[PDB]
Every structure is written in C-alpha cells, then in structure tokens.
Amino acid sequence: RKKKVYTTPKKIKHKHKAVKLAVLSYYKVDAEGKVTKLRRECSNPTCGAGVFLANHKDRLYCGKCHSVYKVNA
Amino acid sequence: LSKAAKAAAALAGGKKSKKKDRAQHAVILDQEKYDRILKEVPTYRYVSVSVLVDRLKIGGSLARIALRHLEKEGIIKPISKHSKQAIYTRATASE
RNA sequence: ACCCACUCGGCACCUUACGAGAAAUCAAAGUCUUUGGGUUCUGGGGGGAGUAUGGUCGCAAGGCUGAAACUUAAAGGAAUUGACGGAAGGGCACCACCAGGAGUGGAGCCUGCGGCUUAAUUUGACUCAACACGGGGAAACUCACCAGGUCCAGACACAAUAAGGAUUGACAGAUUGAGAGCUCUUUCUUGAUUUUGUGGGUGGUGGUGCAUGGCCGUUCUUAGUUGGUGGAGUGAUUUGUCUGCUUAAUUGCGAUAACGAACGAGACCUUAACCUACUAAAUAGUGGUGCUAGCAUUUGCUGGUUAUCCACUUCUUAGAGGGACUAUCGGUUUCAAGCCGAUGGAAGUUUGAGGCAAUAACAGGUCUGUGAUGCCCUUAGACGUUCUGGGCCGCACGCGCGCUACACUGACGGAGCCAGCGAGUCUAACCUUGGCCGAGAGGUCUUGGUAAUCUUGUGAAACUCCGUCGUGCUGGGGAUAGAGCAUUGUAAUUAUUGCUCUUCAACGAGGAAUUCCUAGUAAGCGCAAGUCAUCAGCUUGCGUUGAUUACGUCCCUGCCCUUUGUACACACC
RNA sequence: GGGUCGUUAGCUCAGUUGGUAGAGCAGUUGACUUUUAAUCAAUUGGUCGCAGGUUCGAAUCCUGCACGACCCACCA
RNA sequence: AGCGCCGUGACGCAGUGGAAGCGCGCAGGGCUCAUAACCCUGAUGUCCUCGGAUCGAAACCGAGCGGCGCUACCA
RNA sequence: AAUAUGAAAA
Numbered sequence: 001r002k003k004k005v006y007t008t009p010k011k012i013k014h015k016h017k018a019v020k021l022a023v024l025s026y027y028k029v030d031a032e033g034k035v036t037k038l039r040r041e042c043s044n045p046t047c048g049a050g051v052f053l054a055n056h057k058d059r060l061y062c063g064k065c066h067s068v069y070k071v072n073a
Numbered sequence: 074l075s076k077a078a079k080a081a082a083a084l085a086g087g088k089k090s091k092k093k094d095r096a097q098h099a100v101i102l103d104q105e106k107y108d109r110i111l112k113e114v115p116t117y118r119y120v121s122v123s124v125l126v127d128r129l130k131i132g133g134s135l136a137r138i139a140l141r142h143l144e145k146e147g148i149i150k151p152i153s154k155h156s157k158q159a160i161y162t163r164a165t166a167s168e
Numbered sequence: 169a170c171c172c173a174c175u176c177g178g179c180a181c182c183u184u185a186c187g188a189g190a191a192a193u194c195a196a197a198g199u200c201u202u203u204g205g206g207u208u209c210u211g212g213g214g215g216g217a218g219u220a221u222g223g224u225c226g227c228a229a230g231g232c233u234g235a236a237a238c239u240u241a242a243a244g245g246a247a248u249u250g251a252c253g254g255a256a257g258g259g260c261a262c263c264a265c266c267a268g269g270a271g272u273g274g275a276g277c278c279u280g281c282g283g284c285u286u287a288a289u290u291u292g293a294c295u296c297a298a299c300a301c302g303g304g305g306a307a308a309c310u311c312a313c314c315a316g317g318u319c320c321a322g323a324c325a326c327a328a329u330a331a332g333g334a335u336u337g338a339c340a341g342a343u344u345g346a347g348a349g350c351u352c353u354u355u356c357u358u359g360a361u362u363u364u365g366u367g368g369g370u371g372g373u374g375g376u377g378c379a380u381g382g383c384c385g386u387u388c389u390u391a392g393u394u395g396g397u398g399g400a401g402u403g404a405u406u407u408g409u410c411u412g413c414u415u416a417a418u419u420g421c422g423a424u425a426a427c428g429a430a431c432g433a434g435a436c437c438u439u440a441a442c443c444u445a446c447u448a449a450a451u452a453g454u455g456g457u458g459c460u461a462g463c464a465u466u467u468g469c470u471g472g473u474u475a476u477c478c479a480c481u482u483c484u485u486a487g488a489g490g491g492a493c494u495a496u497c498g499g500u501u502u503c504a505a506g507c508c509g510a511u512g513g514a515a516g517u518u519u520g521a522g523g524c525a526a527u528a529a530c531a532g533g534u535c536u537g538u539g540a541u542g543c544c545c546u547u548a549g550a551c552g553u554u555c556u557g558g559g560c561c562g563c564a565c566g567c568g569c570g571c572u573a574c575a576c577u578g579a580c581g582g583a584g585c586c587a588g589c590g591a592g593u594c595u596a597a598c599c600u601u602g603g604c605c606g607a608g609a610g611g612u613c614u615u616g617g618u619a620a621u622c623u624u625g626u627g628a629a630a631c632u633c634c635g636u637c638g639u640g641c642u643g644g645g646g647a648u649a650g651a652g653c654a655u656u657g658u659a660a661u662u663a664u665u666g667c668u669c670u671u672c673a674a675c676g677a678g679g680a681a682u683u684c685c686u687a688g689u690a691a692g693c694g695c696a697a698g699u700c701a702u703c704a705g706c707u708u709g710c711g712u713u714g715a716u717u718a719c720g721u722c723c724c725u726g727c728c729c730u731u732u733g734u735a736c737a738c739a740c741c
Numbered sequence: 742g743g744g745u746c747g748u749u750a751g752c753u754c755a756g757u758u759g760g761u762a763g764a765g766c767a768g769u770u771g772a773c774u775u776u777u778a779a780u781c782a783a784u785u786g787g788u789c790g791c792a793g794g795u796u797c798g799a800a801u802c803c804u805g806c807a808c809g810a811c812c813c814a815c816c817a
Numbered sequence: 818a819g820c821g822c823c824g825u826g827a828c829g830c831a832g833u834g835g836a837a838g839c840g841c842g843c844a845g846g847g848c849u850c851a852u853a854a855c856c857c858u859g860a861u862g863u864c865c866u867c868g869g870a871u872c873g874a875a876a877c878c879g880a881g882c883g884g885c886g887c888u889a890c891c892a
Numbered sequence: 893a894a895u896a897u898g899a900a901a902a
Contacts, residue, residue: 001374001551004549004550004551006549007315007316008316008549010549011317011350011351011549012548012549013351013549014350014351015349015350015351015352017329017334017335017336017362017363017364018333018334018335018336019355019356021333021355021356022332022333023332023333024332024333025332039355039356050357051356051357052355052356052357053355053356054338054339054354054355054356054357055354055355055356056339056340056341056353056354056355056356057339057340057341057354059339059340060355060356061338061339061340061354061355061356061357062338062339062356062357063337063338063339063355063356063357063358064337064356064357064358065357066337066338066339066357067337067338067339067347068339068340068347069339070339070340074779074780074781074851074852075780075781075851076772076773076780076781076782077283077780077781078780078781078782079284079781079782081844082283082284082565083284083564084564084565084843084844084845085283085284085564085565085566086284086564086565087564087565087844087860088564088565088566088844088845089564089860091859091860093274093679093857093858093859095639095640096639096640098638098639100638122638126638126639132637132638133637133638133639134636134637134638136638137636137637155633155634156633156634156635157576157577157578
C-alpha cells in the first residue's frame, strides 16, 4: 500500500491511568473523635453507602451506580 | 505496444457524436364509394378485407363493416370466417 | 541366333555380418590396440580466409602457391523421441464446413471489461482456455478501496510500577457525525486481573498462484498410455502398441519377434422411454353403492359429499424384477470382425442424456474459500477488529454476454384456458389459502402446511376463439423525464422494487465480419430453484408449442495414427 | 575586413509584440512482466550566451562582446 | 542593386470569384495468438500574416514575412 | 492462387 501520512496532528495521548489522588484519605478531618462523613453516601441499593458521591458542577454523581446518577442536593 | 499514449486516448473524446409515399384510402364512405361497391363486388370472384382495401381504397376497418353489411344484404356468400381473416365470394350461383 | 555347363575381364546387383564402423552403412569403408604388403597427396576446433601479401600464368575475368593479427566454446557428423510443414496416406469433429435455421454485429436498455475521471471509483482474470466470471443480481454489512473515529480480543516469560494503590469506568459541559468520556474540565468509581519496557506471539480479503497444498480448467472429447520377461540397437531408444478390414473407441478380426498383462475405451452407475405382472397405498387415485344438487324431469347425463362404505391398482407413487441381445429375415466383406435394407418391437444412432473418466503436462486460475501454509511486510497515531458516510454504479468513448423490438404469422381488449422440475415456519417466523378493503401495488382478519396431505390442478406464458385496427414510425417500441401512491429495509437519495397518469426518442431486418445447432433437437414461450430482507434483463433445471436442411466432406479451423524432411527442442509464436 | 542572421533544459527544436518559458529526446520514479526491453503516466532540468530603454518589468525589441552561419571584398 | 516566382490537410501537390480536392498519413471496427498486410467506415485546412476593393475570394490589389530563381555583359 | 514478422535471459 501507499506510505501512510496523518492529516491530524497527534491523537495518541490517552487519559492518565489514574487521577493520582495519592493517599486518597479525603474521608474527614477530625480531632480524635469519630471522623464521620465528609461527602454524603449514595442511597441506592447497588451502593449501600459504599461510595462518596462526586461533584462536578456543584451537583453530585455516583461512580458506582454510575452514569446518569444525578443528585443536586 | 498495446498501451496508447494519453494524448492518443484523447481521441476517445475526439470521437464526437457522428455515427454510421403513404396511401390515402377512404376511411369514410360517401355516396360515390357506396355506388362503387355495390356495382363492383358483383365482380371480384374473391372478396376479403385486404382485397377490398387494395382495389377499392377503403380504410380497412370500414372494409370489415362493409363486408358484414354485404353479408346481411346477401350479395356475399361465406366460405370461412375468422377473427383475423374472412373469405368471401359474390354469392355466385355459378359455384 | 538360341539353350545348358564352364572360364577370363568389366558395368553392376541381391542376402547376410565372420568382419568393419560413432552410426548411416560397407564384399570393401574387411583381413586395425592380435596396431607394419608398396607408395603419392591431403587434414589438426570453428571463424578470420582461400582473405592480405610476395611470387607466377592469363588480353581479361581470374587460376596456382598462400599467410598473420584478431576473435570465439563450441562449430560439426550419424542416429533417437518429439514438435512442426503452404509434405504425403488413412479416419474423423456443427467448439469445422457443406444444406440451411436461428441469430449476433445495426438501435435502445441491463450487465461485465478496458479507457477516462476521482478521495476512492477495491480487486483477480485478457485467443480458444478473461469480459451475466470469482457463484460478484454491492443501498449499511458484504468490502478487500476512500475521508474520518474508536477498541484490542499485543497469548506467555522477565524487568520496572505497585494496595500510604498498579488500573478501570465515568454523568454532565467542551470536542466530535455521533447519549464514543475517545480526549479536555470535574470530582468520584474499580482494585493486581493490569499498565510501561524488553522479548515473544496473534491477526491480515496485505505481497508472492513464479515459492506451494488442495481444487478446477485446458492441452483432450479425441483414444491414448505402461510394466514384466523376451527380440533389435554400443546408446538415447525400439518391438510388444501393427501391414489390411472394421468400430465411436489401442473396437475388434487378424498379421506377427513377441508372449502375457495393467490403466483408458468398454464393461459400469444414475436418469428418460415398455410392465392391464409380484408387493401395496385416507399424504395418489379410479369404479360401484349410499346421501345430495341441477337438467332431464327419466329410465339418462354432469356434479357436491370420506367415516357413506365396498371393490380395484388402469392412470399416479414406488421396491424387487422382466425386457433389448442390433432380436429374425435377405444382401454384402480375409468371407471373419462388421455393415446395409426389411420384419417385429416401447425402443434397433453404444436405445437417449449425463456421472465417473488414463500417462504426461501448463511455470493456465485461487494464497480475496479455507484455522492449509512457506517466505517477506505490518502489528497499537496496525495493513488487525469495528463504527459514520461515500466508492465499488462514477462518463468524452471502445469491446463482450444478452433483454427488448423494428408488426398484421401482429398490437390491443374479452373469452377458452392446459404443465413440469422445485421450495416452504415453532420458539422461530417461511410458503401462503379463504374473507374483507383499495384502480393498483398493497393493506387487513384468519386458515392449512415441517409438506405426494396446504400453498398448488402453482388454473404460467406463448397458444387457440370473438371483437377494436389498417399499412401510417400507426393502438408497433416505451426508451426518456415529471408528478403521485405502497412495499422490503434503521436507512432508498446517486430515484431498491411495484403501481397510476403523463412524456413517446432511437429502432424501416442491420457493413465488413461472426456465434450456435442434426430432433422433442433449434427456436418462441414462460415456470421453479440459486443468490434474497426487497430487487433478474443472470445462470442451474423444468415443462408447452415445436420447424427447415442434412444423413456428407476434408475446402476453411482443428483432431488422432502411419510414413517423411528438418539447420526446431525455452519446440513455427 | 566589412553587411546580415542566429545562439532556450544534459541534447534538439519551437516560442513571443511589451505579463514570464512549450514539445521531443535524455534522467528519476511508478504501472507493466518472472525480470528486463519496448510502451505508458508523472517529475527533474531551463536568467533564454553578458550591460541597457519601459511596455511597472525584455527570453522576444535594441547597442556592445564571445561563439558560430551565410553574403561581399582592387585592378587593366 | 534590379526583376521575376512560390507559400493550400501531418507530408508532397493540385484548384476556376460561390470555397476547399488527390495520394500518403491518422483514426475507429473487423480478420490475426499479436503486428503487418487485407476488408467496412470516418474525420482533419487562420488556403503564410494585416488591410482594402467586392454581395462574398485561397484566387484581385496593396503592405509585411519567409523561402527561392534570374540579371552581374563592353572595357 | 496470395500468405511477411514475432525482442533479451530463464
């Protein structure tokens, strides 16, 4: 076949393997008490408070119930 | 050899686009034609649609109709009929 | 002059090979590695070259004598098997012709190829032996091409990263054709499966069909091909495998330094023709009797009705078998194989058509069928896989299969209206009956059928019968365009296809050329299957109607055998 | 010696009056074939032999020179 | 220096005031395995350029261009 | 009766 040449400049750069959140201890800051909850935790049965809901536009999202899970509280 | 030049193949484009009295039968009768038919079909030992068309200049269709009316008036005698040709005589007592 | 025998000397000849020879051949070309009767001349690879030069003869043309430089690996001789011949002999083929038929090539369109074009117009194939071919009738898929975007299904080993996390997925906004997080923003999710790298595999409708298997075609639809042991020859090789006659046949009868065999042909197998026979048959029928309908009115005729039953297998399906073996007769030839005519017979061309089909080969076609593969390339901004949209159809032209016609042997309308091969769904949706609705396509509600049971008697067309016509580019042809109506399909647009109305061009029997064809054959006429979701002008089959002319030839193109010539052997290109 | 004419791709030939280089051969590449040859397609190479007038600007117009090609060069 | 001539398809050459012909060559198509030849067809011409005259010219007459030929004798 | 030619190696 012909020698291949790309019209687009560059496209190999993938998303990173991970966000690199290091220790990921964003659970809560507490002074030797019961540390408790920083974010809320999902009410859906498929999670059962196993997940911290996200925040992208001041509304929250579940990465385990996943996709269109939307709360605005 | 076999492959011609592109200019020679342009002669495909240069090819360019260059490449290698009715009869007036009656079709409608008049008094004169009407007189003509009953005076002459006593002749014409053989009468059919084509013969009437050839020797009386009738437009074929009216030749067929005239044959039916010649049959109705009995001046004609059948030998055979068909949806595409009919054979007729002068109602001759000679044969 | 003959005849018979002999002799001497010639011109030769016939048979053999003791002998000679590389062989063809030779009574000399013998008496030759067992090499010596006498003597003259000539040659040392082929060309250069009988050239130059020097002589010499000649009126001249030229004759005699006669080099070298240089150049080259063969040149050449005799036989062998082929190939080939405008060589001969024999027998043959509608891929040959004759006598013809139908056509093509002339026009329009479908379709394939080339050329051109383009981002791509994917590609293999180019005399028979490529071009309605790759089962290739491509809207997405197919697809291999083009413009773009994903994904990895990169096995496994090791090294690195590394659960105070390897890695994965993310709604939404941007971006993108795109509810592809692909990538960016964002914070969540997942948790040893991975990721990165070194190796190493895996895929490829990527290249090579000239590196291969397999498959097919072709040589090659003709009758050809091979061993054993003998015979000839130093040997390649030859005979067997052939003079004649015959057969479709290397088929036989015969001949015979060959005998006996093997593949091929044949024999064979399937299908198509006869079966009042065996076996039968609510998935085929028929008749009779019941019940019923109509006319007759009737006694007879034509129908409907399987739980009305009974009988039967003629037609229909079959299983096993019979039959054909040129049977018999008359002619004709080693008088054999065989052939010709007639008789009978369902059939007397191998009874018809196919299947299978040998030795050897092509540098035929295919790695785009193959998880069959060698080698090369590539392997993650892959030539892998997949998604969106084009393309395979693009049009100045050339070519090849064809489908329409150019009309009265018709066109049209209304009747009669009769086949065969075959195919079809069930847990998935086929073949569809009947009813209803709509001009139509089609829509609608059900029905039978896993099928001799229902589609389906596939009630096909051509055909016939009765009417409109009119000799006219006309009601022939319906290409070409518009508008509209449905179907298949996620999607039709570069109109899938069907229908309605309108448009109505070329086409006047086709130039040089050229294809096919000997009887249910050509041809006309459609039907089924194939591919298929829809679509046929395509092929594979089937049936309806159904000719003319042959019954021969080697004149063109070719084939097989024998003889022959050859300076050909990648073989008359 | 004078008058005239012409010199452009590696080569050859057109050009054209004042807007810019065309054709063939050659060379490179690809197609083609087993590979070449041939053929085809594309590309390369051209300050137009050196100094002017301006048609804005010359390859072509014009004056020089360096090549060359022609024509003419006492006299009785 | 003077005078005369020619110029027409790619090539050679015709041809008259109503407009372009011949042969060759080219092109298609067939035959051929392919080429040649052969068979059936087809095209292609600012008639050197410009202007004028004419109803219209290749032709007529001017301009130009290119290519030719003749004259060049008496001393 | 006319019927010429078919590149180089393999």
